[PDB]
Every structure is written in C-alpha cells, then in structure tokens.
Symmetry: C2
Subunit: 127 residues, 2 copies
Amino acid sequence: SVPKELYLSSSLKDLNKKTEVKPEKISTKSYVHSALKIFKTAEECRLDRDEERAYVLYMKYVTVYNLIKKRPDFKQQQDYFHSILGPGNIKKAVEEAERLSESLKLRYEEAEVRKKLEEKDRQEEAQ
Amino acid sequence: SVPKELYLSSSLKDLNKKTEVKPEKISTKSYVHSALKIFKTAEECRLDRDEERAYVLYMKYVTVYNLIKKRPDFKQQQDYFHSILGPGNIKKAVEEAERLSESLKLRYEEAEVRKKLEEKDRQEEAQRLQQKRQ
C-alpha cells in the first residue's frame, strides 16, 4: 500500500554510507556511530543473559575502536571522540568481553564433554 | 538468573569469527553466512514497506557479493557458492536496490521540497495576518 514514512536518513548519500563493508570506505564518524549502537546492544544482550551475542558485540566494539584509534583523524580529535564513546564504556567493553570469554570457554567445554560422555554412555548402555 | 541456552556457536574460535570487521580476517564462508542473514532481513524490510532499510540491506548484500566473488576460493568454488546463495536471490537484490534507490531519490526530494514550500506558505500567511490587521 503506502510506504513507511521516511525516518532512517535524509538522502540517498547518507543511506549509501550504511551499505559499505570495507573499512577503507567507512569514515571514522560512521564507525563511532556504529560502535555507539553496538555497545548499547551489547549491554542489552548481557542484561538479557545472552552471553554469546553480548560477547560478540563487546568484542566487535573493541575491534572497531582498535581500528579507528590508529587513524590520524581519530588521533587528531582523540579527546573529542573519547568523550562521545564515553571512557567508562570502552573499559566496560574490554572487561565484559574478558569475563564473557572466560564464561563461554567453560560452557563450550562442558557441552562438548557432556556430548562425548553421552556417546560413551550410548555405546555402553546398549550393551 | 540462568543464561540463555547456547545457540550461536559451539566454540570461542567460531564465535570469534563474528567479531571481525576487516574483510581480510573474514572468510568467504563467513561472508556467505552474513549475506544470507542480510538478504532475509532485506526481504522482511521490503514486506514491511520500509524502503530505506530494505534499500540499505539489498545494497549491502550486493556489496558483500562483489567483494567475495573476486576471491580465489570463491572463484574455485563458484558453483557451490552460487547454489548456496541462490542465483535468483542475487538478481533480486540488484534489482530491488535499483528500484528502491529511484523511489528514495524522489521521495527524499519530495520531502525537502514540500518542507520548504510549507514553510514559505506559513510565513506568507503570517505576514498576511499581521498586515491585514494594520
């Protein structure tokens, strides 16, 4: 019927920025915008107890930060960008990714051992 | 408070592949996984008549495909990756993107023109209200 009312952006140009996958074609300001959303979503996933999604998002946030922090246009305005991202947020992401990695390692190891043991039980039980 | 059951991966190593942003650290297979997900969301956005999001996702899908189709391993396993992605789905993405972009170019211009006109009409009429009085 009628298309949804425009809300995402104000030009095809801004929209085109969202289509890119190469870092070489993603500006520092665009990555900061994404990172803000990735961190927000990572917080929500953590609160929702989705450890894998939360971990992937905190880790991805740190990987974007590590990428753009090497750029001269980031370095030139380091204090400004750090205050947009929030210094407590960058620190939170590292420590959450670390805490979640430690949790996921054990949960993946558990599920794998439990698997192996159930197959061992399968061979022996039917016997 | 119990964590959600594991569902997304079976190892940290596999899960780590989802954290990369540099294409050089993303396998062709991982891009193909991403592309299937982007396509399905584009289709949902299309049916929602959300033209901006649908445009972005169809274009991002085409961008992913153009990036991987040049890779040696994709070219070697060209038939497999086409079977997995679906030759119809690629063709759809390209033509939805072009269709949507023409719609959007016009809708964007319409919105900006109508905005300017409404404001000019507003001020003219305010000015007419004021002077008529005097």
